[PDB]
Amino acid sequence: ERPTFYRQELNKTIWEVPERYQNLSPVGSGAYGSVCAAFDTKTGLRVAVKKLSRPFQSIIHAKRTYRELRLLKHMKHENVIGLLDVFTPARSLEEFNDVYLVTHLMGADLNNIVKCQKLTDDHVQFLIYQILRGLKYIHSADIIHRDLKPSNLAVNEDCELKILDFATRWYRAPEIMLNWMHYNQTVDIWSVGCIMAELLTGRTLFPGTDHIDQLKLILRLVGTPGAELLKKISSESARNYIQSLTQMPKMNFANVFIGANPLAVDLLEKMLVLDSDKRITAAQALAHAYFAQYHDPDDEPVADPYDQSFESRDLLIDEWKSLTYDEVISFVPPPL
Numbered sequence: 001e002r003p004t005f006y007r008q009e010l011n012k013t014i015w016e017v018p019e020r021y022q023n024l025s026p027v028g029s030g031a032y033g034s035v036c037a038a039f040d041t042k043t044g045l046r047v048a049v050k051k052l053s054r055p056f057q058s059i060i061h062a063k064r065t066y067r068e069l070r071l072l073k074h075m076k077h078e079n080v081i082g083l084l085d086v087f088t089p090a091r092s093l094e095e096f097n098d099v100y101l102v103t104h105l106m107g108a109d110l111n112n113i114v115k116c117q118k119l120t121d122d123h124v125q126f127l128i129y130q131i132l133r134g135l136k137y138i139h140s141a142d143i144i145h146r147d148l149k150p151s152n153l154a155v156n157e158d159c160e161l162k163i164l165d166f167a168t169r170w171y172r173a174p175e176i177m178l179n180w181m182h183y184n185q186t187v188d189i190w191s192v193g194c195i196m197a198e199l200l201t202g203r204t205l206f207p208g209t210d211h212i213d214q215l216k217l218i219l220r221l222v223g224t225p226g227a228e229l230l231k232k233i234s235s236e237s238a239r240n241y242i243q244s245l246t247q248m249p250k251m252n253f254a255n256v257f258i259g260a261n262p263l264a265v266d267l268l269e270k271m272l273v274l275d276s277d278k279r280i281t282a283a284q285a286l287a288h289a290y291f292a293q294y295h296d297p298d299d300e301p302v303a304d305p306y307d308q309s310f311e312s313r314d315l316l317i318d319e320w321k322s323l324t325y326d327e328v329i330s331f332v333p334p335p336l
């Protein structure tokens with residue numbers, strides 16, 4: 001049942017992966033973990049192998065490890081990164097302390113291609129359509145990405161895009177900047193608008209230096225909140241700030257994004273609305289005339305129900321670790 005593992009040291013960390021994965025070369029490391037590119041001999045595809053860093057060192061870490069595994073196992077969509085394999089070199093639960101995730105290898109992210117080439121309107125259409133297509137799938141399972149940004153959008157040479165990890169502040173919705181605890185899925189739509197504006201102009205839309213400067217840059221373009229939006233702010237300390245600034249009017253998006261496709265400008269206006277209740281959804285954005293060449297209602301599927309009840313649970317270290325263990329053995333690979 002269990003395959004054969006081989007041990008090797010890459011960078012300053014260790015890797016114990018099955019024999020089917022060969023030629024492990026590092027791609028990029030961080031606080032999340034170490035990612036290696038490998039060749040899968042069972043399928044012939046190039047894969048990305050991610051070793052989690054300290055998966056069960058604290059309650060926050062153990063729950064986070066369980067959350068990522070449950071999330072990656074549920075995502076089955078062409079525009080969302082999915083799990084090709086999940087393994088551990090441990091034979092029992094007692095020695096279980098390392099988790100490895102395997103997925104399709106993507107050569108670059110949207111950050112590596114935005115400044116390398118100012119994208120044409122046709123390429124922006126295809127890239128943003130793929131984001132919204134994957135966002136409709138994610139949002140249909142009551143999941144919010146919360147951290148959409150160019151580095152979180154993997155693209156290959158074929159212009160095919162996938163969402164990952166479902167300055168960062170440059171793409172954050174203003175309701176999160178104001179610490180509103182009841183934001184909805186439309187915070188991701190705000191990030192898409194910031195990303196789509198960057199691809200069209202080649203510039204970061206809101207390159208704020210801090211949480212304060214970020215809001216001033218946003219309010220400079222979309223204007224200060226009106227009376228309808230002000231009625232929805234319960235935090236008196238929040239209103240003590242917004243109602244105290246110099247009131248900014250909403251700028252003409254056709255003038256700010258001059259020379260761009262008028263259909264692209266119209267979509268940005270519906271995406272970059274201050275009031276989150278009036279922001280366009282992912283499903284509505286797919287039907288926008290900007291994506292007429294790509295929109296297909298019968299090929300924009302939704303996700304199966306996702307059980308998020310674990311998020312409101314207070315468990316111990318071994319309990320989160322044992323639940324993560326169960327998800328490893330119960331994994332079923334996707335069909336070839």
Ligand SMILES: CN1CCN(c2cc(-c3ccncc3)c(Cl)nn2)CC1
Pocket residue numbers: 027030032035048049050103104105106107151152154164165
């Ligand atoms: C902001 N993010 C940048 C990329 N992140 C990534 C990228 C990958 C990946 C997937 C497929 N092909 C290559 C690499 C993985 Cl597996 N994990 N995190 C790490 C954090």
Ligand SMILES: Fc1ccc(-c2n[nH]cc2-c2ccncc2)cc1
Pocket residue numbers: 174175178179180225229232233234235238242274275276277
């Ligand atoms: F300046 C702003 C910027 C954003 C908002 C906002 N948009 N949608 C929801 C909110 C919001 C922000 C803070 N508290 C409640 C609601 C309100 C005022």
Ligand code: NA
Pocket residue numbers: 048050082083101102103
């Ligand atoms: Na992965």
